[PDB]
Design a protein around this ligand. Sequence first.
Ligand code: NA
Ligand code: NI
Length: 281
Amino acid sequence: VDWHKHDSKRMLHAVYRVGDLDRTIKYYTECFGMKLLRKRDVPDEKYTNAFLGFGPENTNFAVELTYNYGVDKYDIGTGFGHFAIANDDVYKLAENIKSKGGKITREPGPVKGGSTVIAFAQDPDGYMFELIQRADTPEPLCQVMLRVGDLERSIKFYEKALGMKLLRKKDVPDYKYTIAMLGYADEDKTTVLELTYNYGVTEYSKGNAYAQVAIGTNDVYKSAEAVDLATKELGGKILRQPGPLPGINTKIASFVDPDGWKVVLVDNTDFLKELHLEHHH
Ligand code: NA
Ligand code: NI
């Protein structure tokens, strides 16, 4: 209810799995112009994380790659849409991606109409990146797009569970889809969650590739209460109850939305503590 007004939430990162960490890092840095921000090896649990993006994690959204030792392939499934990168010259960007050995699946040009210039690139594991031409972006990693079976239900869920704003809604009956942009700030200044409904399609597979999106909150207990209240009316479920993780002590909670997409809430202060320990110690 009123807690969302008092909280200061932020989209932190999308977490997903990759077959070859160095290869992805090279593709993102050379083709997409990302920076490698942080890398954490966790050999006791046979994984390595790498965080990449266009600005420091304390002010920007990132991608969090997970490499499970020896595991070289995953199943993306049908529900996962794409990540989007906004850039002021998509023709040049798509040419860069090709010249670095990357793959363009949809050549640069205006969309449906037109006239926004877009392109699509495909990464080594198969994840799609929409390239969107925007003149002066403050946050290039600008969308995570997921498919959903009931858009109204989802919009209400992200509003009530997570305090997101419905930023934009666009129905395109000519092509049998509707989209919504959800987030914590104006669409052109932030990373949005784009939810896509295809007419008469109510289920998709979650696969095992995409893991979750992480959202920072000033109180995981209060935010998890809000989520639990939402899930009672609309669907989804708390998975990990709010509390500190052993050792590091970062407070988190996790849940699934009405479609099965996974969200992790992270205590904002604890997240900054994590970043600090990596970078300054
Ligand atoms: Na599309
Ligand atoms: Ni210190």
